[PDB]
Structures are given as C-alpha cells and as structure tokens.
Short mmCIF file of C-alpha atoms in Angstrom, two decimals:
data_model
loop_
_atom_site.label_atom_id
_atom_site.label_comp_id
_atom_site.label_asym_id
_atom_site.label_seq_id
_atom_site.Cartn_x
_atom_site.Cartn_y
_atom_site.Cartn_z
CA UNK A 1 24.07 15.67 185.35
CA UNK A 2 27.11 13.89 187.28
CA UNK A 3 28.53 13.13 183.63
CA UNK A 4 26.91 16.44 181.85
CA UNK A 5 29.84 18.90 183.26
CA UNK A 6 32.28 16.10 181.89
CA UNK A 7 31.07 15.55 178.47
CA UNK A 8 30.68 19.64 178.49
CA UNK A 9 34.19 19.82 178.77
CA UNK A 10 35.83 17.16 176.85
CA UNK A 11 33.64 19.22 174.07
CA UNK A 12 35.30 22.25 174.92
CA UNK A 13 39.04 20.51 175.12
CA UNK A 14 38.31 19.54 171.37
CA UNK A 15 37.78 23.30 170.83
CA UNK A 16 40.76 24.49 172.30
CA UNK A 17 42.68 21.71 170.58
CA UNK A 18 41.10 22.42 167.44
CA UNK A 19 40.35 18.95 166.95
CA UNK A 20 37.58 19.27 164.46
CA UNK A 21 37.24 15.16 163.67
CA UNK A 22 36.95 14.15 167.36
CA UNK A 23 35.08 17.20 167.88
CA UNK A 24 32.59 16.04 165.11
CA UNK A 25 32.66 12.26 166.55
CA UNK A 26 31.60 13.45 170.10
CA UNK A 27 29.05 16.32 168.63
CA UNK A 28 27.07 13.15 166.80
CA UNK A 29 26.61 11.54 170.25
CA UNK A 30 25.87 14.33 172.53
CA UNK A 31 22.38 14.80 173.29
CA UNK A 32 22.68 18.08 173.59
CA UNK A 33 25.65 20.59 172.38
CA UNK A 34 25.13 23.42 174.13
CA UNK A 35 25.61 21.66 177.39
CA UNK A 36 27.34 23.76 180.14
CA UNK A 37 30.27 24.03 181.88
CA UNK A 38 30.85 24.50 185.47
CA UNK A 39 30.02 28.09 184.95
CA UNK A 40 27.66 27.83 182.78
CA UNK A 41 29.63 28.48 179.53
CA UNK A 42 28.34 26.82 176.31
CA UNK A 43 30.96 25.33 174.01
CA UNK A 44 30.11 27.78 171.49
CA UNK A 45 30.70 30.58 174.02
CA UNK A 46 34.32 29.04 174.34
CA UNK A 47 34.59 28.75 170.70
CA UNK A 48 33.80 32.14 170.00
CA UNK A 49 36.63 33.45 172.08
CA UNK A 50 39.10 30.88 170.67
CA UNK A 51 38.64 32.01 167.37
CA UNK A 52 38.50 28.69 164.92
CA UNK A 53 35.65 29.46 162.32
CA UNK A 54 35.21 25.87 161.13
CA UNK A 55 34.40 24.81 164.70
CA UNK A 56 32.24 27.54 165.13
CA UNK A 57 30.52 26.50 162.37
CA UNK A 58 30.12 22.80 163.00
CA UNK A 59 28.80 23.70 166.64
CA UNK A 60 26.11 25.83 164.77
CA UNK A 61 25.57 22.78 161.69
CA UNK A 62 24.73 20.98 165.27
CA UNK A 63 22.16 23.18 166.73
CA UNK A 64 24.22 25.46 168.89
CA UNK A 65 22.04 28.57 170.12
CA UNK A 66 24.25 31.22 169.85
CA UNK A 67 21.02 33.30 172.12
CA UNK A 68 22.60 31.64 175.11
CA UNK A 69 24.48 33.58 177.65
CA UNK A 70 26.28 32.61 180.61
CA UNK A 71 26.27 33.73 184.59
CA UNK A 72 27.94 37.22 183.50
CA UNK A 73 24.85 37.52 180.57
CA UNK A 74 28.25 37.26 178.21
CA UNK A 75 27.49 35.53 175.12
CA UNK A 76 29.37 34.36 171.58
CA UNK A 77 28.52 37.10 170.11
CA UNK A 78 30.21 39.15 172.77
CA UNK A 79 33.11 37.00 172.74
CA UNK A 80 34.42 37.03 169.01
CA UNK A 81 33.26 40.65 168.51
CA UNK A 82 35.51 41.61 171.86
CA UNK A 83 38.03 39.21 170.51
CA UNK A 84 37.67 40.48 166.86
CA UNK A 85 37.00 37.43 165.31
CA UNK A 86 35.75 38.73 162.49
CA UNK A 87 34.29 35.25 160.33
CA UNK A 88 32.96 34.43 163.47
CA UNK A 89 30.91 37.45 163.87
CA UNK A 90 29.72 36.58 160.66
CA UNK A 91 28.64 33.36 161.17
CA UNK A 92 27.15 34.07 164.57
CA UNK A 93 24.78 36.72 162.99
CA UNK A 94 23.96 34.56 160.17
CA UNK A 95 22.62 32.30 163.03
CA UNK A 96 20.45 35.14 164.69
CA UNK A 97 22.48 35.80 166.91
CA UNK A 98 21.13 39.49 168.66
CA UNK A 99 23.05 42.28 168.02
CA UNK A 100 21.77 44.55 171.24
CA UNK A 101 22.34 42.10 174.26
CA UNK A 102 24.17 43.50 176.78
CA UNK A 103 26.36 42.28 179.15
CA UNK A 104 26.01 42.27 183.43
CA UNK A 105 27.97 45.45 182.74
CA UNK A 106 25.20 46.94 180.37
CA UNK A 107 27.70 46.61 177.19
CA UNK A 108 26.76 45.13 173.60
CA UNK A 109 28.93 43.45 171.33
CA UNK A 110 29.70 46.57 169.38
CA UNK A 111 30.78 48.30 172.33
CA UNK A 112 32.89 46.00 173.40
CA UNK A 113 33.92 45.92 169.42
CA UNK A 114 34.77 49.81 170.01
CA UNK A 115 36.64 49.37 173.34
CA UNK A 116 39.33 46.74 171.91
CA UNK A 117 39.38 48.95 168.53
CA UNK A 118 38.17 45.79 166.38
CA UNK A 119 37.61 47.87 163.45
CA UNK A 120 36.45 45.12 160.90
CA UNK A 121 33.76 44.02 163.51
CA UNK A 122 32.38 47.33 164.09
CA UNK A 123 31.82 47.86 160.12
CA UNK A 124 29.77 44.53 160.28
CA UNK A 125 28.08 44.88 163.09
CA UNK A 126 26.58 48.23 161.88
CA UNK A 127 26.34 46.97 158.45
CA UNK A 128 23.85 44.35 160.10
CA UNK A 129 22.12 47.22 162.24
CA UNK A 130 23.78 47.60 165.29
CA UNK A 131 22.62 50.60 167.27
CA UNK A 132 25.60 53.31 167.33
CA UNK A 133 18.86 48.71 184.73
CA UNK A 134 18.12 45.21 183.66
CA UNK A 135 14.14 44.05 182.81
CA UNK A 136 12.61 41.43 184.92
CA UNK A 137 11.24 40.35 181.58
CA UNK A 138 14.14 40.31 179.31
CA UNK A 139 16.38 38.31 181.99
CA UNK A 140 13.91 35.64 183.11
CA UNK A 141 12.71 34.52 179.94
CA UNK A 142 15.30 33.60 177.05
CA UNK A 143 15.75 35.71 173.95
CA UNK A 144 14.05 33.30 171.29
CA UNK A 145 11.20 32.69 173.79
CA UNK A 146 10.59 36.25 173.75
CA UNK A 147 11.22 36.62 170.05
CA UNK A 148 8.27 33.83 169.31
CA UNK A 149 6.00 35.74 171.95
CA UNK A 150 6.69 39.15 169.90
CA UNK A 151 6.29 37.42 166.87
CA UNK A 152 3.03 36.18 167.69
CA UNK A 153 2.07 39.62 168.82
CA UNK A 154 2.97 41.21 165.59
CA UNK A 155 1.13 38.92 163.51
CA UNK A 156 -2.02 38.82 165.48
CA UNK A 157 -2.59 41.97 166.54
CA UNK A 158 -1.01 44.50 163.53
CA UNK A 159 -2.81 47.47 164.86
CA UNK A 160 -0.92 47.65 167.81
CA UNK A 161 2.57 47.39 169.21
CA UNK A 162 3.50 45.03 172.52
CA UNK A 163 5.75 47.18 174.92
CA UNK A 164 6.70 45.80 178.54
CA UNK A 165 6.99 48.59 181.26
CA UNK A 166 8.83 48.23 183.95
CA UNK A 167 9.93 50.23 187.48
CA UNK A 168 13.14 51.34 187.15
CA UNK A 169 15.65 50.31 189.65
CA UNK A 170 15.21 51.56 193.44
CA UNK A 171 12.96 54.24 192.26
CA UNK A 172 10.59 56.41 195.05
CA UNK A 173 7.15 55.19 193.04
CA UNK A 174 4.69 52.90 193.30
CA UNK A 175 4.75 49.56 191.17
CA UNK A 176 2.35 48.48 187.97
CA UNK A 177 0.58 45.18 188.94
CA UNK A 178 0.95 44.32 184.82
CA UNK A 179 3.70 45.30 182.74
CA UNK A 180 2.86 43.92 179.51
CA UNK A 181 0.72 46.30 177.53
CA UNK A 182 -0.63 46.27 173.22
CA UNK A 183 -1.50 49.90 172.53
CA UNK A 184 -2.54 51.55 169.29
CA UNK A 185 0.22 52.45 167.02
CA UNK A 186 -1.30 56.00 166.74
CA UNK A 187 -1.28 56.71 170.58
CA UNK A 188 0.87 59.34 171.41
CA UNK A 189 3.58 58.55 174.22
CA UNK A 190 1.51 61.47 175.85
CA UNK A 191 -1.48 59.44 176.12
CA UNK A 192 0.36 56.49 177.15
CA UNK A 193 1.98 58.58 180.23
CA UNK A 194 -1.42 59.27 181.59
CA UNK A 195 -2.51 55.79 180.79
CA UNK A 196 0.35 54.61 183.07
CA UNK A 197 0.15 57.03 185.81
CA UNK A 198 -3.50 56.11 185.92
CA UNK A 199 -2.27 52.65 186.36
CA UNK A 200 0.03 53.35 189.54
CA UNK A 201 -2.30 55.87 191.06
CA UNK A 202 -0.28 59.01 190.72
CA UNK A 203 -1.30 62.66 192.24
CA UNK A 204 -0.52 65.62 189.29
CA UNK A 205 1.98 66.61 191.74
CA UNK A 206 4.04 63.17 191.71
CA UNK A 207 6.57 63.01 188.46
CA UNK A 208 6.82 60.40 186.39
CA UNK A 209 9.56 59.72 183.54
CA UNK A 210 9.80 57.44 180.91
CA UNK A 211 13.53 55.99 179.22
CA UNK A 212 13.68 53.65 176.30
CA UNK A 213 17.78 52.93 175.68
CA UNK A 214 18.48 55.65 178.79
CA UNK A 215 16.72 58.25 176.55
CA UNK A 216 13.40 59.87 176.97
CA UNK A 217 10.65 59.47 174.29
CA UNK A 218 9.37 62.97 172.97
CA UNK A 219 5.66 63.23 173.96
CA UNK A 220 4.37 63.83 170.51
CA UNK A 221 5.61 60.96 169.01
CA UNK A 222 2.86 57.96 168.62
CA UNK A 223 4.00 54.51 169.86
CA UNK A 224 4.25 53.03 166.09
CA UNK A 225 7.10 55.55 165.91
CA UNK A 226 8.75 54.87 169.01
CA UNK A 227 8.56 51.11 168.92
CA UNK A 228 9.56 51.45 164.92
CA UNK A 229 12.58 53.17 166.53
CA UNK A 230 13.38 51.48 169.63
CA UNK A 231 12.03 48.11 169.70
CA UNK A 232 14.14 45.40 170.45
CA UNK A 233 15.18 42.24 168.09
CA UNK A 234 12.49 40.04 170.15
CA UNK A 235 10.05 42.80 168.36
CA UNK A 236 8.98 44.46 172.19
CA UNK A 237 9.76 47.78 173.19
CA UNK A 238 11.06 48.46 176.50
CA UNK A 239 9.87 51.24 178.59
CA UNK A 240 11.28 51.76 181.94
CA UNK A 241 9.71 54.30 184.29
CA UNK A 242 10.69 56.46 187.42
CA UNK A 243 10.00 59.39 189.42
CA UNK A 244 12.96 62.00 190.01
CA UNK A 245 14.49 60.12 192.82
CA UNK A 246 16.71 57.74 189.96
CA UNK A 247 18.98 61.33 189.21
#
C-alpha cells in the first residue's frame, strides 16, 4: 500500500490531464484500477466529475466498478449526473451502475440531477427507471455482493420474496435478533406485521410501524406487490420498523 495511494493518483492526474495514451499505458500495468485515493475516491469517481467520456469509458473497458462509493457513499454515478455529464450517465448505466444509491445525505443521482437542473440527465435517468436512516445491511456489504445474494434468492426460492428488516434509527423498541426474512409472495403486509411483532415480543398496546422509501405499506397489499413495487436493484426489499417515538 506505501506505493498504492501513488499509482492511484498518477491515474487520476492522467484523468484530469486527459491524457488518454498514458492513461491507457499505466491502466495495462495496474493491478487493479479502481485503486483509491487518499480519501478513498476511485479514478472513475474522479472521472465522472471531470467529464471526458472516452476516459470514462476506457476505465470501464478496464474493469472499473462503477458500484463503488467513497467515504461520503458518493459515487460516479452521482458525480456526472450532479455534474450533468450526460454520455457519461450513459455509459455508467450501461455498466450497471444503480440508479437508487443515495448519498451520506440520503440523495440519489436524480435528485441531485433535479437540484443542479440537469435536464438531459433527468430524462435518462427516468427513461432507465429512476424512482421520481441508513441499513446495517445495505452499507456493510457492497452493492454487487448483495445483488448476487438477491439473485440467488430469486432463482431458488420463486415462491417467495427476500426482504431485510431493520430498527429504525434511535427508535423506543426492542430489536429483531434476525433481519433477513423469505416470505410468501401472497402474505399480506398485515400478516407480516404480526409476524414481526411476534418476533420482538410486542404487547397489543405497544405500536409498531413499518416504512419502505419513508412511506408506509398499505396492510392489504401482499408482499409480491410490495417488493414488485419497492424492491431495490440488488432484488431485496427494505423494511424499516419503529414505534411512535421516530415522529
């Protein structure tokens, strides 16, 4: 590592030169391209926000993973879509990049699209599907890691959706000792209230209330139709739950 932070940058000094050749040269002998900065910043990260699609797309024709994110969750995506780099976008979410990470401050890339009035990017983005408290689970494992997992779950078990459930923050409840659950697709959200308040020991007395994206579920719907609606692009639904005391 005492030359990783070195190589990182002279990679990155090639991308704010926009010297593609020498960037090319160095890209064949790096042994990895998405090696970090000091603060954790992947070249493609500073690529994104400088805007050169050919580089860009040589980082990618090199194995960039443009799933990365950096010490303030920020990722490329992020960066060209705040920047409105609009062939970048492009290429980015030809690469998989996910369209619903958020930020440290909570914000996607079409948010941050809407906030700098990047008009072009906010047609693509919700051409491509974009959807007009931070999980334990989502931050400590990486996004394609989580994508194979739900993956795997979809394919082996197509009867049932994978949802992770999780406390929401500084809330006056008890906590679920497991918080990955595979329920029927016909189960109602009803049924799986009860199934979780059986699981942290409630009294009838003691609310509990459930948010997927900050909105509550209707209890009539069955998870198939929530998790059709809400899952996320690593194919799990998130569920966070609380009792009255997050208002």
């Amino acid at each position: 590592g005492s030359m990783s932070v070195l190589i990182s940058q002279s990679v990155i000094n090639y991308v704010e030169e926009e010297n593609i050749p020498a960037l090319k040269a160095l890209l064949e002998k790096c042994k990895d391209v998405d090696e970090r900065n000091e603060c954790g910043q992947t070249p493609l990260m500073l690529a994104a926000e400088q805007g050169n699609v050919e580089i860009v797309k040589e980082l990618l024709k090199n194995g960039a993973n443009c799933n990365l994110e950096d010490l303030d969750n920020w990722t490329a995506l992020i960066s060209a879509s705040k920047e409105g780099h609009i062939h970048i976008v492009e290429e980015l979410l030809k690469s998989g990049a996910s369209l619903e990470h958020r930020d440290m401050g909570g914000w996607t890339a079409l948010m941050w699209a809407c906030y700098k009035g990047r008009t072009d990017v906010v047609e693509l983005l919700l051409s491509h599907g974009a959807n007009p408290m931070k999980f334990v689970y989502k931050e400590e494992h990486p996004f394609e890691k989580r994508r194979s997992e739900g993956e795997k779950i979809r394919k082996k078990y197509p009867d049932r959706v994978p949802v992770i459930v999780e406390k929401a923050p500084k809330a006056r409840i008890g906590d679920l000792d497991k918080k990955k659950y595979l329920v029927p697709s016909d189960l109602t959200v009803g049924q799986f209230y009860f199934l979780i308040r059986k699981r942290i020991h409630l009294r009838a007395e003691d609310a509990l209330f459930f948010f997927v994206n900050n909105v509550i579920p209707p209890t009539s719907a069955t998870m198939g139709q929530l998790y059709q609606e809400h899952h996320e692009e690593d194919f799990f639904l998130y569920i966070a739950y609380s009792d009255e005391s997050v208002y």
